[PDB]
Design an enzyme around this catalytic site. Structure first.
Site, mmCIF file in Angstrom:
data_model
loop_
_atom_site.group_PDB
_atom_site.id
_atom_site.type_symbol
_atom_site.label_atom_id
_atom_site.label_comp_id
_atom_site.label_asym_id
_atom_site.label_seq_id
_atom_site.Cartn_x
_atom_site.Cartn_y
_atom_site.Cartn_z
ATOM 1 N N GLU A 733 57.183 18.231 143.745
ATOM 2 C CA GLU A 733 56.983 18.626 145.162
ATOM 3 C C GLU A 733 57.986 18.021 146.215
ATOM 4 O OE1 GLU A 733 53.194 18.348 144.397
ATOM 5 O OE2 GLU A 733 53.587 20.369 143.802
ATOM 6 N N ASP A 734 59.336 18.324 145.709
ATOM 7 C CA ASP A 734 60.469 17.920 146.542
ATOM 8 C C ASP A 734 60.868 16.110 146.417
ATOM 9 O OD1 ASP A 734 60.189 20.387 147.104
ATOM 10 O OD2 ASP A 734 59.599 20.160 149.142
ATOM 11 N N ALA A 735 59.843 15.587 145.907
ATOM 12 C CA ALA A 735 59.950 14.142 145.595
ATOM 13 C C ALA A 735 61.151 13.768 144.706
ATOM 14 C CB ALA A 735 58.665 13.439 145.163
#
Ligand SMILES: [Zn+2]
Ligand SMILES: [Zn+2]
Lengths: 1102, 83, 67, 48
Positions: A733-735
């Site tokens: 998730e975009d991390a």
């Protein structure tokens, strides 16, 4: 190499941008203001008179800014950077020439300053005009700085370009279940109003003016305006079409329904409805009042006894209404770009200065009357001491309007807010994008999405991707790259030219033949009709291409509405376009050869008729080719460069045509928040906040835009070695995964500089603040609170300050002899370093201290990064270099980004950027990712294969923790990554107990105030749905506001200290805990005539 | 204001999630007020975890008074309430 | 601002090659690619460290306040 | 309901104004001028 027109006509864009920069709307508008509009105001308000002493007058002869007649040079202006440093206004004096009569018949001139004019940066009057970066170095100004803003009280303020519907133009709109209303918002130089026009019922047509009591029926006003025959009425408004006749006949019948009419009978009918004029000139209350009513009904001011022009204007208004009632889709889109205008800083300041000058003249006349009302010894000598004192009001108003953004114009009567905004200094791109920013008209009923959608008619005029997020989404727009805004040019010499070219005046035209030929409109007004409308259009366009009329006049032909339209007003958005004649372009590469050789700057392509400006309306009549290859011999123009449909900010995106559009919009958002280089004088600046990258790199894949706007000179980002793979599980998730030891070597390393300003203000009691301090202990060293303070009492430059220490030891008088301590204390979770203490004085002999606090920042967990494609995300984990995967050469990624971010966002531009950047670093050249162009993927793959890499940029890596080959090839290469301003160090906030609101006894509501986190109605609802009663009680009563109140059992009224103080008994007083909010509510209700009496019962006894 | 006799009872013989949470909260509050515990701690200091251990051993000395909407109530000990 | 001492990815010293790269570009002119290969910058990380660097310190020194 | 005192309808006409406690309308300390700043309800009851 021989110049190829297909791929070298793009140089017209740099040619255009050399003389017409991105910040040119503001620049030209302000130059026009200070050069001609100031003369226009001083010549409108040229003389002031008094009732007494008729043999006396004041004359305003001349107006000037920043120059006197004594010397050839201009006056010394404190340079704009010094104005920024000392918190003053970058302004030039307004000089006028005064003719004030002497008592002994003496006539003289003078050069008297009546105030300071806030001068826009890099305008004609600005000191940085035509500077060679050497005078800019001496003036501590950045050569790459946009200019076009104002420094008032040391803050950079920009007057944003204003969107609004075009004035003096008919707009027709329908509606469901209500009828059709169509207005003409007409603005004069002193009176603005809107002639509303709606169908009340029964297909009856009415004219609805604000000054008119009740909407006058249309036949009445048509008969009043000279058109009194009642057949030519129907002829003008109806033509020969059968349907419109019966659509219109009802209000023809009404004209006789009331009483049969002459012209003057209708005029009296109109005049009976005029409201008031503040009870002045009461002797005008007759039939003649309608003359002023019709004079001030629109912009078509009539100064004679012929009403044909206004009559035909209202007849067209009516006929558009009748067309709409016959069928909808004859309405105009209120969001069509051709129907809007852009007010600019110069126009805004013109009207503001006009209002301020009217106030100044009224007050000067008041003072003159007060002086000359005296009977005896009325000495005329030095009658200008008043104006010497009185010059402060113009300066004060002119500065404050820009400073606050609220513009209180008494004459024009509206209050507007947000005209100015602080120029953003997050990044160089942030500043440049705040320039060329358009704000749309408010009171728009934001609940709907008409003026929120993107229109096809904004192609090439407004950027198609730079629209902001969150709340003003679609309301704030940005200018495209290659665009011009028209300026107001005189309309009278074009009417004569139109008459020369075959247009017959309407006064020569009869009603019965009006809708049989095309009618020529000048700025929406029917000036006449012409045969051969297409020949007239062609001859007019030839005249404009040969320079006989201004290049900004727009001429186009509407076939549905049989009209040739000619527009001359300013504010229309236009862009240049190559003229295609006889199926061929007019540039033919000899002009291009001259242009790159140095000859034929962009203006000469306009003088030569090779390039012309097209507004949105002429684009209806045009047929543009995007490329020279698809020029068919029916097309009228050819695009210079199609990538100009994106603004300055959207030009930072490599390969934007390979991305989904929301990704481009989000990058337009994040690029303004990217941390990097601000200016060449960024370390001389002292700003309220500044984020700077230690090691900014220019993007490996750039565009034509970023080098046209000098983004490669102050870049904001770094070319991280990126492996696109799943890793460590901390990248979901975009991390992002960040390489430790890349952060050690300086990747992503930024710093923040914060300024604190204090003023040692003097007081009425000959007293003022002082900055003494630095007490020591018994061992001679200073106390810890003053560990970095210096003898001067101002923080030592270069020393660290921790939380609780003082860097400005200010003391305030106790009788403001005795000074109470009011020092400036550093409250920061991490220590800063004093890097600049500026000791100076404001313009009012008041001591000014500025301290710059610098703080280095390592990239850590939770810091936000973005990659020019809307792919943002925080650092999920920081891992050691050896744990990172490596390739054959031992190259290790600085950043690992999840492959799951690609398929759904559909950012193929990011993959192409990675491959192009890899090929570019391996080839030694920066690549290009320009929109609709850039370095071809086959060429980059060829470079990759030639150097031993896979054509697709997928290298085989080894695992850093197992050492084995990864079973999948990993997309490996450089990607430009920007560090965004949202760092977790400024977001981490936690409160246990502390400051509370005085009124409500609840935790404060700010992070700087140690505020608490609000548990709203939504969280209350969630906790209820869980069924957790005790948690509700603890979160909402125990941990927020618990008050032990005294409640009497007899009267449900709160007591104090075990005393009911209403029955005065203290016997029935009970002790319980309730929210202090509830106690406050009960005490507020008792203040009104409500007695919320509490009834109690025992919890026990069952 | 009339307790239903124990011999017949219409409410469920199973413990609800709210009953369990409230019993654990009450027992943990009592333990945090230095009430004696009837379980072998094995070095546990948290009153909430001690209360969970007693609940697992069914040694919590509390009863649940379930009021019916008509005003009556039937008493259910923690032991007899089956989980 | 100024050329970083080490490559961000490898840790190879590239801060001692900035002036040599500039001199390769100016004196006895070369392509940027062959000038990077002449200095020993084989890996594309070390290549980008020099190729994409923007020497902003020379521009900041134009505003030196203690002349 | 006129069973209790104050159930008389004439008590619903403004005759006595119960001016609120100071805690209901706190007077802030040292805003702009050195002097304390009053607030809206205080000003309105002063004018009344
Ligand atoms: Zn009482
Ligand atoms: Zn390297």
């Amino acid at each position: 190499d021989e110049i190829n027109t297909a791929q070298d006509k793009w140089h017209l864009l740099p040619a255009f941008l050399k003389v017409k920069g991105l910040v040119k709307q503001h620049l030209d508008s302000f130059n026009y203001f200070v050069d001609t509009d100031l003369k226009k105001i001083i010549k409108a308000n040229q003389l002031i008179l008094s009732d007494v002493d008729p043999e006396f007058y004041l004359k305003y002869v001349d107006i000037r800014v920043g120059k006197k007649s004594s010397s050839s040079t201009k006056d010394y202006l404190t340079p704009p950077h010094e104005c920024r440093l000392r918190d003053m206004t970058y302004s030039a004096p307004i000089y006028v020439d005064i003719e004030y009569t002497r008592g002994r018949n003496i006539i003289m001139h003078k050069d008297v300053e009546i105030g300071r004019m806030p001068i826009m940066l890099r305008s004609n009057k600005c000191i940085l005009y035509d500077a060679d970066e050497s005078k800019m170095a001496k003036l501590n100004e950045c050569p790459l700085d946009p200019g076009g803003y104002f420094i008032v009280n040391g803050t950079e303020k920009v007057i944003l370009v204003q969107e609004q519907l075009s004035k003096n133009r008919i707009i027709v709109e329908a509606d469901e279940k209500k009828g059709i209303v169509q207005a003409s918002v007409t603005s004069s130089t002193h009176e603005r109003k809107s002639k509303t026009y709606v169908i009340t019922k029964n297909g009856k047509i009415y004219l609805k003016h604000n000054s008119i009591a009740e909407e006058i029926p249309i036949a009445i006003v048509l008969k009043a305006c000279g058109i009194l025959s009642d057949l030519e009425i129907m002829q003008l408004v109806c033509g020969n079409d059968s349907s419109y006749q019966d659509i219109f006949a009802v209000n023809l019948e009404e004209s006789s329904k009331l009483d049969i009419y002459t012209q003057q009978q209708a005029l009296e009918y109109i005049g009976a409805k005029v409201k008031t004029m503040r009870r002045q000139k009461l002797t005008i209350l007759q039939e003649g009042i309608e003359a002023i009513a019709t004079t001030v009904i629109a912009h078509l001011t009539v100064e004679a006894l012929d009403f044909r022009e206004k009559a035909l204007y209202i007849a067209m208004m009516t006929r558009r209404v009748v067309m709409a009632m016959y069928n909808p889709k004859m309405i105009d889109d209120r969001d069509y770009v051709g129907n809007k205008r852009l007010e600019l800083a110069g126009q805004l300041i013109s009207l503001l200065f006009e209002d301020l000058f009217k106030k100044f003249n009224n007050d000067f006349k008041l003072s003159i009357d007060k002086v000359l009302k005296k009977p005896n010894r009325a000495m005329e000598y030095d009658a200008l001491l008043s104006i010497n004192v009185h010059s402060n009001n113009i300066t004060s108003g002119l500065n404050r309007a820009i400073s606050t953004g609220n513009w209180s114009l008494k004459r024009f009567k509206m209050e507007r807010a947000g005209v100015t905004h602080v120029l953003s200094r997050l990044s160089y791109i942030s500043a440049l994008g705040m320039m060329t920013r358009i704000s749309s008209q408010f009171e728009k009923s934001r609940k709907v999405s008409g003026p929120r959608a993107l229109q096809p008619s904004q192609f090439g005029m407004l950027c198609t991707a730079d629209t902001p997020e969150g709340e003003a989404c679609g309301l704030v727009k940005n200018l495209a790259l290659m665009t011009h805004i028209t300026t107001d040019d005189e309309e009278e010499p074009i009417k004569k030219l139109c008459y020369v070219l075959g247009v017959e005046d309407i006064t020569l035209i009869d009603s019965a033949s009006l809708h049989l030929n095309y009618g020529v409109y000048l700025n929406g007004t029917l000036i006449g009709s012409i045969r051969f409308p297409t020949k007239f259009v062609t001859q007019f366009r030839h005249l404009r291409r040969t320079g006989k009329v201004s290049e900004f006049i727009s001429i186009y032909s509407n076939s549905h509405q049989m009209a040739v339209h000619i527009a001359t007003d300013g504010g229309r958005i236009c862009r240049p376009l190559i003229i295609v004649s006889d199926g061929q372009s007019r540039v033919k590469d000899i002009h291009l050869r001259k242009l790159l050789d140095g000859e034929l700057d962009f203006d000469d392509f306009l003088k030569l008729g090779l390039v012309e400006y097209l507004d949105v309306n002429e684009e209806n009549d045009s047929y543009i080719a995007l490329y020279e290859k698809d020029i068919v011999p029916s097309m009228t123009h050819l695009e210079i460069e199609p990538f100009t449909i994106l603004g300055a900010v959207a030009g930072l995106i490599p390969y934007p045509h390979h991305n989904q559009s929301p990704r481009n919009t989000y990058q337009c958002a994040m690029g303004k928040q990217a941390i990097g280089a601000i200016a060449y004088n960024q370390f001389k600046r002292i700003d309220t906040l500044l984020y700077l990258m230690t090691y900014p790199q220019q993007p490996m894949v750039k565009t034509k835009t970023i080098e046209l706007i000098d983004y490669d000179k102050l870049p904001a980002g770094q070319n991280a070695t990126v492996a696109v793979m799943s890793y460590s599980g901390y990248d979901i998730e975009d991390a992002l995964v960040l390489n430790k030891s890349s952060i050690d070597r300086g990747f992503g390393r930024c710093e923040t500089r914060r300024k604190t300003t204090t003023v040692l203000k003097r007081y009425a009691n000959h007293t003022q603040d002082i900055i003494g301090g630095m007490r020591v202990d018994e061992n001679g060293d200073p106390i810890w609170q003053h560990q970095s303070l210096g003898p001067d009492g101002l923080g030592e430059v270069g020393m660290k300050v921790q939380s609780g220490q003082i860097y400005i030891n200010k003391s305030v008088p106790t009788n403001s002899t005795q000074y109470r301590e009011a020092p400036v204390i550093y409250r920061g979770p991490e220590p800063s370093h004093i890097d600049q203490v500026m000791m100076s004085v404001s313009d009012n002999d008041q001591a000014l201290i500025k301290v710059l606090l610098r703080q280095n920042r390592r990239p850590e967990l939770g810091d936000k990064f973005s990659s020019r494609h809307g792919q943002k995300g925080v650092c999920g984990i920081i891992v050691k270099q050896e744990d990172m995967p490596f390739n054959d050469q031992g190259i290790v990624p600085d950043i690992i980004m999840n492959p799951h971010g690609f398929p759904s966002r559909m950012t193929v531009g990011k993959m192409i950027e990675l491959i192009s950047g890899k090929a570019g670093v391996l080839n030694g050249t920066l690549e290009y990712g320009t929109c609709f162009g850039g370095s071809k993927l086959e060429d980059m793959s060829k470079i990759l294969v030639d150097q031993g890499f896979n054509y697709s940029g997928k290298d085989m890596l080894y695992s850093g923790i197992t050492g084995e080959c990864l079973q999948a090839y990993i997309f490996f290469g450089p990607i430009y990554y920007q560090k965004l301003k949202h760092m977790v160090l400024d977001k981490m906030h936690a409160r246990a107990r502390g400051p509370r609101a005085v009124l409500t006894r609840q935790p404060t509501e700010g992070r700087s105030r140690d505020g608490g986190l609000r548990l709203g109605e939504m969280e209350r609802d969630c906790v209820i749905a869980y069924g957790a009663s005790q948690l509700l009680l603890e979160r909402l009563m125990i941990s927020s506001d618990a008050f032990e109140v005294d409640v009497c059992d007899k009267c449900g009224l709160m007591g104090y200290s075990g005393w009911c103080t209403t029955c005065k008994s203290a016997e029935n007083i009970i002790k319980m805990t309730i929210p202090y909010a509830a106690k406050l509510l009960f005490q507020e209700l008792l203040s009104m005539n409500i007695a919320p009496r509490l009834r109690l019962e025992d919890i026990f006894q069952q | 204001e009339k307790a239903i006799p124990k011999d017949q009872r219409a409410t469920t013989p199973y413990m609800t999630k709210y009953e369990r949470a409230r019993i654990l909260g009450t027992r943990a509050l009592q333990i945090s007020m230095n009430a004696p515990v009837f379980v072998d701690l094995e070095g546990e200091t948290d009153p909430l975890r001690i209360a969970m251990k007693e609940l697992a051993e069914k040694k919590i000395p509390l009863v649940i008074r379930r009021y019916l909407p008509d005003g009556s109530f039937e008493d259910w000990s923690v032991e007899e309430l089956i989980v | 601002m100024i050329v970083p001492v080490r490559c961000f990815s490898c840790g190879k010293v590239v801060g001692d090659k900035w002036e040599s790269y500039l001199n390769l570009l100016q004196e006895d002119e070369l392509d940027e690619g062959t000038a990077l290969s002449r200095l020993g910058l084989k890996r594309y990380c070390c290549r980008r460290m020099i190729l994409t660097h923007v020497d902003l310190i020379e521009k900041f020194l134009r505003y030196n306040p203690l002349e | 309901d006129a069973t209790v005192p104050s159930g008389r309808p004439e008590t619903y006409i403004w005759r006595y104004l119960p001016a609120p406690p100071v805690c209901i309308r706190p007077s802030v300390m040292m805003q702009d001028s050195p002097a304390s700043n009053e607030d809206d309800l205080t000003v309105k009851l002063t004018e009344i």
